[PDB]
């Protein structure tokens, strides 16, 4: 089915499918079993920031996650994305809850993509930045339980009125326009993504996490991907 | 039908519908009869550059058209776009030919839009830049005879293989994603558009012109808008 | 002496030199007696945001000042800056206190300037953004009592350790590199400046204000410009 | 003396100081003896483009050099710049000629630097872009024989009126403002530089090359650095 490349912010350790024994950040290339992970000192109720970068010369996907006044976590993986994804993709955010839960709120999201050709001055670029989400955000495709406009935020998974997070929820938000990540005459292709999130849970064991992902343009939530599968994969293979 | 705001680069003087007696640039608010025009010293076969700017504080749409080594032409019009267009629009390029013709080639196109909120640091932005167009440009909606990929260019109206422009042709290209130009808490909204074009005709009387336009998101080419109506209006009212 | 163009955030009404009877925003072209002003509902202790824009086609300097959850204030003035300032200038922030006082803290400052030539694709640009100021900010020229690094902020006027603002203080911060605002082949020149500030005073009558200004590159604080003269002018003419 | 990190475009093979037997691109960390090099198919009289990128997470300096209609050359080197350069640096372009010569013309130059803090939304950035150089470019420090304004270009080494390049020439151009490349709370620091150049020589054996470099802020041309030492190093160690 879908082709997924994702950076996961995994809040619950599912050691049975390969997660380390703590909250962690990981790089997923077509499988929920991360190719690489780093321990993440997740802070319930605090606003964090994730930064994701990549370029076609180095062929290394790197991510940094931090909280104000704290040391940051970083994970990197060598991978040639031209060999994994199609030339046209869509980028988005995904999150899920299962038996354990949490709010998966997005307060801001920016993305920049650049394709530099061998022609003198030939640069194709795409940049979007949301610091405020409105009730009817026509430039986003919302899937599953994702909603916008609440407090000017993006709520990826269900939250009840009292502001409480609901279990077994899954939601994704994708930028409306397709993104071009390869071109036959490109000499350098690169992208950078930043998002700020608020993960809060009334429980000691929050679950499941948030992921930034890149997929085929027609990607949709796979059946039964609530919980540990982050709304990205159909199974744990 | 559609709601159109356009900056026209009108190459043929249709004095019967209000055009001045020379090639000119004009600002069209819902009608082909420009609200304002300026004489334009059009240069057959030369690459020109058009710059369009606007902001919600000044409420003035201004455009500058120039050619290398030449004096530029400029036209400005006071208009509050919040009172003319919907909150969500699509931006694009349109061109036509009729009994007289010309090539309407686009070599590059960039657009930036910004919505600054009253919240501290709340900026929503959209930026795209094409310096090269590919055969299958999934982030553009091509309408009518518009095609991409020829010489890495965007051909808005039909050109035969030998490179000759065809008469009675009409084509438009729109950026795929909707653009947000008003938000209830916005303190300043602004946009800027730049495009470079090559208008060439084997004839002494080239026709009809190229226009940068902003419209309702579902805008489509009105019937019989070839020729003097630039692929934007259904009639000359 | 110096040539000054400034947007003032005037917190104290010096009706004897032309200020309206309330806190106001104004546009100063070579004199502290603003060419234009608008009433400003100044909020003691709240973080505000000022946005300043200008372009050589419209020849209109406009500014918008707002606070979160509040209506904004705006002032505009028609002026051709090519006829007032030199081709090379420096941009900066200035503030003062006199018998009455206040803190003049800058939490962030961004500036973008663009010169678009008539050559195809000829754009010269300069952009800087500070969201954090460090103790030794080598890209700023600090004049008078201005200091950086305190809380990652820029303090334009003196504040004692307990955090209290001092009277008769004056300070300015200028971006190190000269800015080019005119070029003989330019078709459009424009700039945009944004800054967020925190004006706080233990008193009912805070004074004197903060100004964004543009000046000759070698501008320095005029003698006796504390108080009502905002660190910008030598006298009240 | 100076601390230099440079990307060289070396046009003459000085095999006696370690150059490969052909024109090449190389990464120089404090010595003219490149840490890494790649063969470069240099094209006399054609306009080329160099792209340089780096980020503090990956710690890899990479460069790509290309000509229109040709395959590009690329070289990469793992290096932690925080361990080699000071926290504040200046960036620039340098070139030289010796017994053999060539024109070292720069037609455009852009640079972007970003420091992302662990504070939510804390980004410091600097960006400059020159597509046209004027006779009196006050935002550049010109050293040695470098001159601006000729044809709107930057001439790094001496060219006589007839347009002929002179031997034993050396020149550098540095951006006026210091650049901040490290900050104690930074989570990611990165930069990207692009320049287009025209190397032309009436001779079969052009010499010496052009380099993009990063140095201590007070760097100056070392004595006797004409020729093979590219205006960057005092000797061949
Ligand atoms: Mn898990
Ligand atoms: Mn995991
Ligand atoms: Mn006409
Ligand atoms: Mn007309
Ligand atoms: Mn006053
Ligand atoms: Mn005043
Ligand atoms: Mn050499
Ligand atoms: Mn070498």
């Amino acid at each position: 089915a879908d082709t997924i490349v994702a950076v996961e912010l995994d809040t619950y350790p599912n050691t049975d499918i390969g997660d380390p024994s703590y909250p962690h950040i990981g790089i997923d290339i077509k499988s929920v079993r991360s190719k690489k992970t780093a321990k993440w000192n997740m802070q319930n109720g605090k606003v964090g920031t994730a930064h994701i970068i990549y370029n076609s010369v180095d062929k290394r996907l790197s991510a940094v996650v931090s909280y104000p006044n704290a040391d940051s976590a970083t994970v990197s993986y060598d991978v040639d994305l031209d060999n994994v994804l199609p030339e046209w993709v869509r980028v988005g955010l995904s999150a899920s809850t299962g038996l354990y839960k949490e709010t998966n709120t997005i307060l801001s999201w920016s993305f920049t993509s650049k394709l530099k050709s061998n022609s003198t001055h030939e640069t194709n670029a795409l940049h979007f930045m949301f610091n405020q989400f409105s009730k009817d955000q026509k430039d986003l495709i919302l899937q599953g339980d994702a909603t916008t406009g609440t407090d000017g935020n993006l709520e990826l998974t269900r939250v009840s009125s009292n502001g409480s997070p609901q279990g077994s929820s899954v939601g994704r938000a994708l930028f409306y326009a397709p993104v071009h990540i390869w071109e036959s005459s490109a000499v350098v292709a690169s992208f950078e993504a930043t998002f700020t999130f608020l993960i809060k849970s009334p429980d000691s064991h929050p679950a499941d996490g948030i992921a930034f992902f890149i997929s085929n343009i027609d990607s949709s939530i796979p059946s039964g991907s609530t919980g540990r599968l982050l709304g990205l994969f159909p199974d744990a293979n």
Side-chain angles (χ1 to χ4, degrees), chain A:
Chain A
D2 296 339
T3 304
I4 299 288
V5 171
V7 168
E8 57 167 59
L9 281 55
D10 189 338
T11 55
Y12 188 100
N14 303 90
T15 57
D16 55 328
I17 60 166
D19 277 14
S21 278
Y22 38 82
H24 54 281
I25 56 173
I27 290 163
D28 304 320
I29 310 295
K30 289 185 297 171
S31 158
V32 77
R33 298 192 185 244
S34 306
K35 295 320 187 191
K36 191 86 174 272
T37 60
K39 187 175 191 262
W40 173 36
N41 291 308
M42 195 269 286
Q43 277 184 250
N44 197 317
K46 307 325 180 69
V47 172
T49 299
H51 306 280
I52 293 170
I53 53 184
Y54 173 83
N55 71 81
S56 68
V57 175
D58 297 328
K59 283 150 202 319
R60 188 169 179 100
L61 181 53
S62 293
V64 186
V65 190
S66 63
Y67 287 94
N69 304 153
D71 287 316
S72 77
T74 176
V75 64
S76 286
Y77 182 63
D78 294 313
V79 54
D80 185 319
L81 292 182
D82 300 330
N83 287 315
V84 184
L85 295 159
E87 150 159 37
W88 285 99
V89 299
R90 276 196 162 107
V91 297
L93 298 164
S94 187
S96 62
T97 55
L99 287 190
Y100 295 83
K101 68 209 138 42
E102 74 195 18
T103 66
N104 290 87
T105 315
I106 302 298
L107 298 62
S108 65
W109 175 27
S110 61
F111 175 85
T112 303
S113 185
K114 289 164 183 174
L115 277 176
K116 291 155 166 194
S117 285
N118 66 156
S119 321
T120 180
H121 300 159
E122 214 90 316
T123 304
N124 283 20
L126 166 74
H127 169 74
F128 61 78
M129 166 185 284
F130 303 101
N131 277 293
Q132 202 181 56
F133 302 81
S134 56
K135 268 84 142 210
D136 163 47
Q137 191 69 48
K138 304 200 176 278
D139 52 326
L140 291 178
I141 294 163
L142 291 172
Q143 301 182 326
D145 299 336
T147 52
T148 54
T150 298
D151 280 297
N153 298 322
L154 164 57
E155 291 294 2
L156 290 174
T157 49
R158 209 153 195 157
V159 192
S160 55
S161 317
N162 31 205
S164 294
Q166 306 313 301
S168 315
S169 172
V170 63
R172 324 205 301 190
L174 293 78
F175 185 66
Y176 193 79
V179 174
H180 206 189
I181 54 151
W182 177 90
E183 206 277 329
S184 67
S185 69
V187 309
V188 52
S190 63
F191 67 77
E192 74 167 66
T194 297
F195 55 99
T196 61
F197 57 89
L198 178 33
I199 292 165
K200 200 186 329 93
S201 179
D203 309 319
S204 269
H205 298 289
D208 276 279
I210 297 178
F212 164 71
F213 69 99
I214 313 180
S215 77
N216 37 297
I217 65 181
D218 49 319
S219 167
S220 64
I221 295 156
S223 321
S225 57
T226 46
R228 70 176 66 199
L229 302 172
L230 300 174
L232 299 188
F233 316 96
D235 55 53
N237 290 137

